[PDB]
C-alpha cells in the first residue's frame, strides 16, 4: 500500500497563490509519511531545469512553521526554457539523476499547460537522453511514466476545468479588507471608490469581489458592457445617489474591455464619473496586494487536503492513467485528467479571442454565468411586472452568524423580483409569537452584505411553547411560507412546525432552513454559514498566540475553541494552524492518549520546532478540562517547556463575514428563494397554499457536490439532539490528515480520497 | 528472601485490646505479599485446640475493611485446654495437619506465657505424638521447630520485657473522653469525680490517667498508700477546695490495695469523702467501656507496623534463635526473647507478692517509676526551700499545636519547683519584643493540660526583625534561660538567636526548643507535640467520610490533608485509614504514577471492596491539585465507580489533646525543664550565665530511642528551610507498609527492622 | 426481594446508612418491572424509607394507580434524610445526626483559632436547597450569618453582614463563623465569600473555608 522505495517531486511555478506553503507542506509531509523520499525544487521549472543543488530532498521539519505564511519557500521562476525541448530535456535529465518519477507541480494554468506537454514528451525526451548518452538503457526503462498530479496555485481561476483554486479565497480576503475599510466608514460625503483588480485574464477575482460588496457597476473581460454603457453606468450611479446612498463601488478588472477589443482603464472611468457626476473619484489599484497577507482558512484546509490527495493519487497511479488536476467541485474531492483540462482552457482563450466570444462565459463554468446573473439581480431593482398572493416572512433563529444579513438581504431581492410579499420577523420565533412583523422593501436590507451579526434579532427560543402565537401571527399576516435562517435551533424549530403540521392547518406551509450558525452543527449540510468567518477569526487569533512566544523560549498554547459538541471548528482550526491535537467529542480520548500526546509533544519540543499548540473543543470531555490539560501539559513538560491558556471566548463570535460567508449566504438564498417559488407553485392548488408533505420543509445543503434540499423530517434520523449535532460528519475524516500532518501514526485506510472525473463538458 | 513454601499461623486471645484487628490484617497481608501462606486460627488457642474449622487460610480480601474496628475479627477465647499437656498436644497435631511452623501470638501476659511454654514443649510434644502414631517419623522431622512471634494486645501493659502494648492508647483515649465530659464543662458546685479503672494487676493506665487528667489523688497496686492516708487525702481535697477549685479527680485502680492485702474500694473512698468533705461524690466504673470503641492512630499505625515487622521476623527466623516479642521501645521496634519477658513478668509478679513489694516498682520499667514520680511531683506544690537566682521565659511561637499547654504547665510547674523565677511570654517572639513578659505562679497554669490550642499566645514572626527589642528585653527581666515551645519557627528562631550570640551579649542564655506543630515538620524529634492529635483527628474526618459511601455505592474520595511540604500526616493518617494512596512531596509523582495507582484503584473496586481512600498532601505537587486528581479518577473510574472531594482544613487543628500528647507535653516539659537547671548550673560563672556553646541550645528530640538533645546549629544541616522540613525523615519507610497493604508491589529492601535485644535488667 | 425474618435485623439501631441498598431512581421509568414483582411477590403493602425521592416516587405510584391495577396497595413514606426537604413531617429522619455532625465539625473549626488570631470560618454545609441544615447549625454554632436559597440574599447583604462581622470582630469576640448552603446562591459560592470577607476584613481579621462534605453523612445515628 506504501508508495516506498520511490520518490516524489514538488514543485511550485507561476504567481505565489498564497496558501501554496500549506500545500506543499502537506505534499511534503505526506510523501516521507508513506515512506515516499520528498525532493523540493526551488524556483519550479527553472530549479527543474539547471536542477543539482536546485533539487534537494526534504525532511520533516523542512515545512516545519510555514503554514501560515504566504507566498511559497519553495519560490517560483518565469523559465522559458521549460517552453524549449532544450532546457525540457535538462529538466527530464535532473529528474532522472535523482530517480524522481513521480512530479506533483502546484501552479496556474500556464504552469499546468507546461506539465501537460512535459509528460507528453517524457518518452520522447528520455529517448533522446540515452540516444545522447546522457543515461544507459537501463536505468531509463526504469522511469519510463512520469506521474503528474497538478494543483491549481493561482489567483485567476483561469483553469476552467476546475472550480476553485489555491489563493483565490485569500486574494478576496485582500480585496474584501480594502473594500470594507470604504465601506464601514461613517460615510460622510458623496465619493466614488473604483477598485481595480488585476483580473487581467479572468474576471472571476472582479465578480465575486463585486458580488460579496455590492458593486454598482462591474467592468469584467467575460461579459464586456454594452455600447452606449458610458451613459447607463452614470445614470446608474445618479439614482444611486438620488436614493441617498453616499458611496459608489466600481469593481474594473484589469482586463476590463469593450465589445470591441479596446481595453477600458481605470483612469477613465474615474475621469468619466468625476466628468458627469462631480463625485470625488480616487482608483484604488491592488496590485501585488492580492496576492499578499497570510492564507485564508479556507486556502490551508483546502490546499492541506487536496496536497495530501495529491500525494495519494500519485502512487496509486499506474503507467496507464494520466496526468490529473486534484481539486474539489463542491465540497467533493475530485480528480480531472490533466489533458482534458488544457483542452477546455485553449477553447475559452479561443473562444474570447472574438471566435464563441458572447459563448465563452459558459465554457467558463456554470458558477461564473450563475454568480453573474445573481449580482446583476441583487444590484439593481428591475421592474417586477409579475405579481403573485405569495407571501413569505425571513427569521433568524438561534446564535447571530455572520452571514445572515447576506442571506437576508438576497432572500428579500429574491423575493421582491419573483412578486412574493416579503415580511421579516425581528427577534425570530420570539416576534413570530409576538408580531413583531414588518414587512421589507428593496432597499430596506441596503448595505447588510457587510454587517455581521444579525440585523434582525435572534433568539434561541423553539417554537412549540409558543405555538399558538405563532400560528395566529402566520393567519393574521397571511405567512404562506417560512425562511428561516440560523443554527440547530433554526432547523429544531422548523421541525417543530412541522411536527404540529397535523394539529394546525395553517402550519402546512413552504419552509426552508438556511442553516447558520458558528458551530457547523445543523443537520443536511456540510458548511453553516458563518462557520468559515469563526474558523478565520480562530486561526488568527492562535497565528497570534503561537506568534507570542519568541525565540528560544520553548512553549506550548492551550487553545480552547467554541463550538459545543460540534468538534468542526477545533479540527480545521487545528488543520489551519498546524495544531499538534485538537480534543474533541467526537473522538472520545482517555489519559492513556493525553501521555502519548504530551510525550509526543515532549520530543517535538526537543527538537528545532519550538511552539506547539494543542486545540481543545469547549466541550470535548467531562473532567479533562482546558485547566486540566493546562496543568498536564505544564507538569510533564517541566524542564522541557512552558504551557499557557488562552480561553478563544467570543472573539470568534462577533467579526464581521469573511467574503466567502458573505458569497455563500448571497447564493444560497437566492437559491432558497428560487426553490420556494418553485415548491409554491407547485403546492398551489384549490386557490390555497397547502404544504403537508414532508418535502416542503427542508434545509438548504451544499452537501457533497452541489446544493441539496434534505426534508428535516429525513434528517431526524441522523440528528443528536441531545449534543445538537448530526450523527454522521463528513470532517470526521480529516482528522486523519490533522494527526498525520502532526507526526501522529495513524492508519487512515477509512479516508477516501476522489476518484478519476471527467470535464463536464 | 521471600518466605515462600512456608504458612504463618495468627491468633488473638485473652482480652481483645482495640487495634487487635490492624495487627492481624497487617500480619496476613504481609504473610501473602511475601508469599507464604496465612491461616487464621479463631478463638486464639481455643480454635487452635479444637482446629478443623476454626483454621481457615486468608486471602487479601479476608482482613479487608477491619483496621478501624476494636476488638477483634478473629475472636479470643479463654482456653485452659492449652494450660494442659493433653489440649496444647492437640493443638501441636491441628498445626501440624496445615504445615504452620510459623505462629503469630497477639495477646497479653498469659498469652504470651502459653505461647513460651508451647515453644519450649514443641519438640517434646512431637515426639510424644509420633509415638502415640498420630503423625509419622516423617513429616515430624519436617515442623521439628516452632517459630513464635509474639505480639503485645492488652489495655494492662503488665508485660514487664515491653514500653507500650497494643490497645494501651486507645484504652487511654476512652479513660479520658470520659474525664473530658466532666472537665470541659463549666464546673458549677464542689463535686468530687471517683474514676475506677480496670487496671486489676497493672496500674499503668490508672497512673497515665492520672497523669493526663492532672488527677488530685492515685491509688495504684505498684506504690499503695502509707498508713494514714485517709486523712493525708482529705486534707489535701480541703486545700484544693480552699484554693477555689471546684472539682476533685480521683483515679482507684481496680486493683488498689493498702500497705497490707487489704483492697481499697472505689465505694469506700466515694463514702469516705462525702462523710468528711460533704462533696457530690459519684464513682464512675468504665468496666467493659476501655476495651471498646475505634483504635486510636497511634493503635492502628503501630499495631500496623508490629505485625509487619513481627512477620518478618518470622520468616528469618532460623531453628536456633528464640521466640520473640516483636515491640516499640520508644519510636524504635525492637524484638526482646519471649523467655526472658516471662521471666520478667513472673519477677514482678512474685515481688508484688509482698517479697520486694516497695522495689517492685523498679522492675515494673523505669517508664511507670518516672511517670508516679512527674505525676505526684506536678499534683500538689511542695515547698521549694531551694532557690537559685535564675529566672527563664516560656514562649510559643508558630501555630498552636495541641499540648502545647500540657508543656508550658510542666516547665511552669518543675521550674517553680527548682526555685527559678518562671516568666510566660504571650505571642511568643513578638510579646519578648513588646515586652509581654508576665510572672507565673503555679496555680497560673492550673487546668491547662485539656486545653487545646496555646493559652499563651502564637505568633509566627521570627525574632531577626525585632532582635534589638528581644535583647533589651531580656536584660530588663534578667531571662537566664529561654524556652520555647513551638513548631518549626519555633526552632527556626532560636536558630537565629543562637547566631546572633555573636553580636548581642544578652543572647547567651540557655535555649531549648520543644517541637511542637501539626506538621511534624520539626527536625531532631520523631513525634513533633500535636501531630499525634492531628493524625487522630484526620482519620477520624476520613473513617466518617469512608464511612458514607454506606457499603453499596462504590466511591474514591480524594481528602486532602494539611501538614505543609512535610507528608507525615498525610501517610501516616493513610495508614491508619488504610488508603490506597497518600500523595505526598517527599514521593515525587508523574502521570505514569498516576495511571498506574488509576489502575489499582478501578481493579480494587471491581472485587468486593466497594469505599477507596486517597489522601493528598495539600503541597505534594504544584499542578496535581485535588482537583486534578479529582477529574482523573472520576474520569477513568467512570461506568466503575464515582468520586467525590474533601478538604479537611482546620478539623485537624483545633482538638483537645490526645492523651499521648498531653503525656508526651508533660513528660518532656518537665524534662526540658531538667536540662535548662542542668545546663543553667553547669554554665553560671563569676556571677553571670554566659551560654554561648551550640550545645547550650538545643531541641528536645526522642529521636530513635529516648529523649535527646540536638544541637540546633548541628540539626541545620539536615533542615531543608525552603520547604521547612528536616532534608532526612525517619517515617519514609512507612510508605513501603502503607504499598504493601494497599497491594502495590514495591521492593521493600529499604525497610529496616528492629534486631534482637535483650531486656535492660 | 428477600423476605425478611425477626433476628435479620438484629444490631440494625446503631448502624449508620443503610443495610439495605438505596438508590435514588424513580419507579417511573421501570414501572412495568416493579407491577410485576408486586404481582409475583403479592405485596399487599409498601414502606418505603427514604428521602424526597422516596416521596416523590410513592406519589409517581398513586398517580399511575389509573393505568396499574396492582399498584392500589397501600403505601407508606418514611422520611428519611439529611437534607429535612421532605413535605408532610417536620423532621425527616437522621436531620439530627446530620445536625449534630455539622456543628461537631464548625465547634472543632471554630476552636481552631484558639483564642489568639481573629479570623472568620466559611463553612459550606449541605442540604441541597432545603437551607434547614444549615440555619439550625447556625444556631447550635452561634453562626453569624446561614446563607440559604429560601431566604434570598445580595451582594447589598452581603456588605452589610461583612460590615457588622468587622464591628463585632474589633470587641472582644474573635472568631467569627458564617455557613453557606451549597445552593443557595448561583453566583455568590463559597469562593465568592471567602474572597469577600478577607477583602473586606483587610487589617481586621483572616478568611478561611472549609466544604463539609460527606462528614455531616456517614456517621451512626444519634440517640
Ligand atoms: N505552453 C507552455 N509550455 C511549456 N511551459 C509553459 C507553457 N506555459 C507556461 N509554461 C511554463 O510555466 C511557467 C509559468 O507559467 P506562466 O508564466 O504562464 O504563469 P502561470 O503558470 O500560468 O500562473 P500565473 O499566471 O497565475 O502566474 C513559465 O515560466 C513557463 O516556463
Ligand atoms: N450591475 C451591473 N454590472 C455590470 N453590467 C451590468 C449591471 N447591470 C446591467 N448590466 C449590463 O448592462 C446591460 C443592460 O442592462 P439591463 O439589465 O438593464 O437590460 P437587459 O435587457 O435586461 O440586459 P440583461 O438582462 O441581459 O442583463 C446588460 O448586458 C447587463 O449585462
Ligand atoms: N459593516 C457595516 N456596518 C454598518 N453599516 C454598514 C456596513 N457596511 C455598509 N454599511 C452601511 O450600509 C449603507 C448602505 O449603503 P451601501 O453602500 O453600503 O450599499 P447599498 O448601495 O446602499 O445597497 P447594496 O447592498 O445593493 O450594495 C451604507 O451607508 C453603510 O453606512
Ligand atoms: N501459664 C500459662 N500456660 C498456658 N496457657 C496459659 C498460661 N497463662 C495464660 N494462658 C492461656 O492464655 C489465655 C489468656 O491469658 P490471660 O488470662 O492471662 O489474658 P491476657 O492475655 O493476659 O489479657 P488481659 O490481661 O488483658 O486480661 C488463657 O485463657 C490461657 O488459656
Ligand atoms: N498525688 C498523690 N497521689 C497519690 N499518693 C500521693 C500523692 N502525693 C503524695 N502521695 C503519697 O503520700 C505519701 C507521702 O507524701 P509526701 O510527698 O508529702 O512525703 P514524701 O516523703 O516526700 O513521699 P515521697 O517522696 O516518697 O513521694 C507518699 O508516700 C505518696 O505515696
Ligand atoms: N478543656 C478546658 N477548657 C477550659 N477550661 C478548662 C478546661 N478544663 C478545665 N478547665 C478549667 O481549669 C480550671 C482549673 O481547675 P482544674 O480542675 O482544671 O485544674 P486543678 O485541679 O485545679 O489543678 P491542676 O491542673 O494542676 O491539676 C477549672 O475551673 C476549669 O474551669
Ligand atoms: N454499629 C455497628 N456496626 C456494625 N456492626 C454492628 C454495630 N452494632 C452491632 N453490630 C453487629 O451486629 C451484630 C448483631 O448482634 P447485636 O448484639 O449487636 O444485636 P441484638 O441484641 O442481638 O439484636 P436486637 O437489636 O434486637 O437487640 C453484632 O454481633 C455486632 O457484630
Ligand atoms: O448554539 P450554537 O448554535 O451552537 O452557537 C454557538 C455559540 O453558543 C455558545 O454556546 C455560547 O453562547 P453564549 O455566549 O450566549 O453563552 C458557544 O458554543 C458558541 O459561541
Ligand atoms: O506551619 P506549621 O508549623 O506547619 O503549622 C501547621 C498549620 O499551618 C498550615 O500551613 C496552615 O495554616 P493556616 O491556616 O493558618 O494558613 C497547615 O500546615 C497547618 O494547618
Ligand atoms: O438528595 P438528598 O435527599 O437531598 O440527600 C442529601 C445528600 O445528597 C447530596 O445532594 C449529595 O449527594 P452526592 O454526594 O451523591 O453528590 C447532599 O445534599 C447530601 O449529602
Ligand atoms: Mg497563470
Ligand atoms: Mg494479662
Not at 277 to 294: K, N
Not at 490 to 517: H, K, N
Request: contains cysteine; glycine residues 10%; aromatic residues 8%.
Amino acid at each position: 500500500a506504501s508508495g516506498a522505495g520511490k520518490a516524489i517531486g514538488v514543485l511550485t511555478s507561476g504567481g505565489d497563490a498564497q496558501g501554496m506553503n500549506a500545500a506543499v507542506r502537506a505534499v511534503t509531509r505526506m510523501g516521507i509519511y508513506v515512506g515516499a523520499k520528498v525532493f523540493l525544487i526551488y524556483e519550479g521549472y527553472e530549479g527543474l531545469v539547471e536542477g543539482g543543488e536546485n533539487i534537494k530532498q526534504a525532511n520533516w521539519l523542512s515545512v516545519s512553521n510555514i503554514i501560515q505564511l504566504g507566498g511559497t519557500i519553495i519560490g517560483s521562476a518565469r523559465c522559458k526554457a521549460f517552453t524549449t525541448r532544450e532546457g525540457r530535456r535538462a529538466a527530464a535529465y535532473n529528474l532522472v539523476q535523482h530517480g524522481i518519477t513521480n512530479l506533483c507541480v502546484i501552479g496556474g494554468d500556464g504552469s499546468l499547460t507546461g506539465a501537460n506537454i512535459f509528460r507528453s514528451e517524457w518518452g520522447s525526451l528520455l529517448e533522446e537522453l540515452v540516444a545522447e548518452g546522457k543515461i544507459s538503457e537501463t536505468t531509463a526503462r526504469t522511469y519510463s511514466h512520469l506521474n503528474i498530479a497538478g494543483l491549481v496555485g493561482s489567483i485567476d481561476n483561469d483553469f476552467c476545468g476546475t472550480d476553485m483554486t489555491i489563493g483565490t479565497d485569500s486574494a478576496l480576503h485582500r480585496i474584501m479588507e480594502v473594500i470594507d475599510a470604504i465601506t464601514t466608514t461613517a460615510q460622510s460625503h458623496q465619493r466614488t471608490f473604483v477598485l481595480e483588480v488585476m483580473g487581467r485574464h479572468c474576471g472571476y477575482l472582479a465578480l465575486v469581489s463585486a458580488l460579496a460588496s455590492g458593486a454598482d457597476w462591474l467592468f469584467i473581460p467575460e461579459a464586456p458592457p454594452e455600447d452606449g454603457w458610458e451613459n447607463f453606468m452614470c445614470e446608474r450611479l445618479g439614482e444611486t445617489r438620488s436614493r441617498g446612498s453616499r458611496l459608489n463601488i466600481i469593481i474594473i478588472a484589469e482586463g476590463a474591455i469593450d465589445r470591441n477589443g479596446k481595453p477600458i482603464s481605470s483612469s477613465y472611468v474615474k475621469d468619466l464619473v468625476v466628468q458627469r457626476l462631480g463625485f470625488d473619484t480616487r482608483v484604488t489599484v491592488l496590485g501585488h496586494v492580492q496576492r499578499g497577507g497570510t492564507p485564508s482558512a479556507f486556502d490551508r484546509i483546502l490546499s492541506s487536503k487536496m496536497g495530501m490527495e495529491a500525494v495519494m493519487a500519485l502512487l496509486e497511479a499506474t503507467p496507464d492513467t494520466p496526468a490529473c488536476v486534484v481539486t474539489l467541485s463542491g465540497n467533493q474531492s475530485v480528480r480531472l485528467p490533466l489533458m482534458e483540462c488544457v483542452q477546455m482552457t485553449k477553447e475559452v482563450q479561443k473562444a474570447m479571442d472574438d471566435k464563441r466570444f458572447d459563448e465563452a462565459t459558459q465554457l467558463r463554468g456554470g458558477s461564473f454565468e450563475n454568480n453573474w446573473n445573481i449580482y446583476k439581480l441583487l444590484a439593481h431593482q428591475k421592474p417586477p411586472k409579475e405579481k403573485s398572493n405569495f407571501s413569505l416572512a425571513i427569521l433568524n433563529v438561534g446564535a447571530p452568524a455572520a452571514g445572515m444579513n447576506a442571506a437576508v438581504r438576497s432572500a428579500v431581492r429574491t423575493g421582491i423580483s419573483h412578486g412574493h410579499t416579503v415580511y421579516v420577523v425581528h427577534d425570530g420565533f420570539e416576534g413570530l409569537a409576538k408580531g413583531q412583523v414588518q414587512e421589507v422593501g428593496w432597499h430596506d436590507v441596503a448595505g447588510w452584505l457587510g454587517r455581521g451579526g444579525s440585523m434582525l434579532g435572534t433568539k434561541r427560543t423553539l417554537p412549540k411553547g409558543q405555538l399558538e402565537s405563532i400560528v395566529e401571527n402566520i393567519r393574521i399576516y397571511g405567512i404562506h411560507a417560512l425562511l428561516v435562517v440560523g443554527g440547530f435551533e433554526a432547523y429544531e424549530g422548523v421541525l417543530q412546525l412541522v411536527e404540529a403540521r397535523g394539529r394546525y392547518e395553517e402550519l402546512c406551509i413552504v419552509m426552508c432552513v438556511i442553516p447558520a450558525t458558528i458551530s457547523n452543527n445543523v443537520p443536511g449540510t456540510d458548511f453553516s454559514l458563518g462557520s468559515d468567518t469563526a474558523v478565520n477569526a480562530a486561526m488568527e487569533s492562535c497565528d497570534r498566540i503561537k506568534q507570542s512566544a519568541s525565540g528560544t523560549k520553548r512553549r506550548v498554547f492551550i487553545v480552547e475553541t467554541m463550538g459545543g459538541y460540534c468538534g468542526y471548528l477545533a479540527t480545521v482550526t487545528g488543520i489551519a494552524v498546524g495544531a499538534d491535537a485538537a480534543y474533541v467529542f467526537e473522538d472520545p480520548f482517555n489519559i492513556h492518549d493525553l501521555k502519548v500526546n504530551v510525550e509526543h509533544m515532549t520530543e517535538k519540543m526537543k527538537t528545532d520546532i519550538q511552539r506547539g499548540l494543542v486545540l481543545r473543543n469547549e466541550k470535548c470531555h467531562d473532567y479533562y478540562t482546558t485547566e486540566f490539560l493546562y496543568n498536564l501539559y505544564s507538569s510533564e513538560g517541566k524542564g522541557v517547556f512552558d504551557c499557557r491558556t488562552n480561553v478563544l471566548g467570543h472573539l470568534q463570535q462577533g467579526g464581521a463575514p469573511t467574503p466567502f460567508d458573505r458569497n455563500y449566504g448571497t447564493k444560497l438564498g437566492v437559491k432558497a428563494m428560487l426553490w420556494l417559488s418553485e415548491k409554491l407553485r407547485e403546492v398551489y392548488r384549490k386557490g390555497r397554499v397547502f404544504a403537508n408533505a414532508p418535502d416542503s420543509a427542508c434545509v438548504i445543503g451544499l452537501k457533497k457536490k452541489a446544493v441539496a434540499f434534505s426534508p428535516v423530517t429525513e434528517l431526524k434520523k441522523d440528528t443528536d439532539f441531545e449534543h445538537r449535532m448530526p450523527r454522521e460528519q463528513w470532517w470526521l475524516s480529516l482528522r486523519l490528515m490533522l494527526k498525520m500532518l502532526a507526526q501522529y501514526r495513524i492508519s487512515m485506510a477509512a479516508y477516501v480520497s476522489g476518484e478519476l472525473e471527467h470535464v463536464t463538458r
